[PDB]
Design an enzyme around this catalytic site. Structure first.
Site, PDB file in Angstrom:
ATOM      1  N   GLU A 222       0.831  -1.200   0.000  1.00 15.51           N
ATOM      2  CA  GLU A 222       0.000   0.000   0.000  1.00 15.51           C
ATOM      3  C   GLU A 222       0.869   1.256   0.000  1.00 15.51           C
ATOM      4  O   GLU A 222       1.897   1.307   0.677  1.00 15.51           O
ATOM      5  CB  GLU A 222      -0.942   0.017   1.206  1.00 15.51           C
ATOM      6  CG  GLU A 222      -0.257   0.008   2.557  1.00 15.51           C
ATOM      7  CD  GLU A 222      -1.256   0.007   3.703  1.00 15.51           C
ATOM      8  OE1 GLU A 222      -2.169  -0.851   3.692  1.00 15.51           O
ATOM      9  OE2 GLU A 222      -1.126   0.859   4.613  1.00 15.51           O
TER      10      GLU A 222
ATOM     11  N   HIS B 245       5.914   0.442  12.068  1.00 15.99           N
ATOM     12  CA  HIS B 245       5.301   0.880  10.810  1.00 15.99           C
ATOM     13  C   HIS B 245       6.194   1.763   9.942  1.00 15.99           C
ATOM     14  O   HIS B 245       5.976   1.872   8.735  1.00 15.99           O
ATOM     15  CB  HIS B 245       3.965   1.578  11.073  1.00 15.99           C
ATOM     16  CG  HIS B 245       2.858   0.631  11.413  1.00 15.99           C
ATOM     17  ND1 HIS B 245       1.527   0.951  11.256  1.00 15.99           N
ATOM     18  CD2 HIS B 245       2.886  -0.643  11.875  1.00 15.99           C
ATOM     19  CE1 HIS B 245       0.782  -0.085  11.602  1.00 15.99           C
ATOM     20  NE2 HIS B 245       1.583  -1.065  11.980  1.00 15.99           N
TER      21      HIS B 245
END
Ligand SMILES: [Mg+2]
Length: 84
Positions: A46, A83
């Site tokens: 993504e 992340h």
């Protein structure tokens, strides 16, 4: 395609080598898949936004993601722990 590790991402990778070998294998699997299809495939690729616009993220685990960028001749790894 050359593989480029930021200083921080290489440290992340080394951390995994001395912490969890299966995570290392998954990172390797993701990199190999990315070489095949840069923006699709394993890890549910993504595109990131805002301060990280231009980068992509694939799932290593829920907590850990492979953050990268692809140019005409290289795969840049920005991070592979947390992340980003
Ligand atoms: Mg970090």
């Amino acid at each position: 395609m050359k593989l480029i590790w930021s200083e921080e991402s290489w440290d992340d990778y080394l951390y995994w080598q001395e912490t969890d070998k299966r995570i290392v294998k998954k990172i390797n699997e993701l990199i190999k898949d990315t070489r095949r299809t840069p923006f699709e495939g394993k890890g549910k690729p993504e595109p990131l936004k805002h301060n990280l616009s231009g980068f992509w993220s694939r799932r290593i685990t829920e907590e850990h993601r492979l953050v990268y960028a692809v140019t005409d001749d290289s795969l840049l790894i920005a991070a592979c722990r947390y992340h980003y």
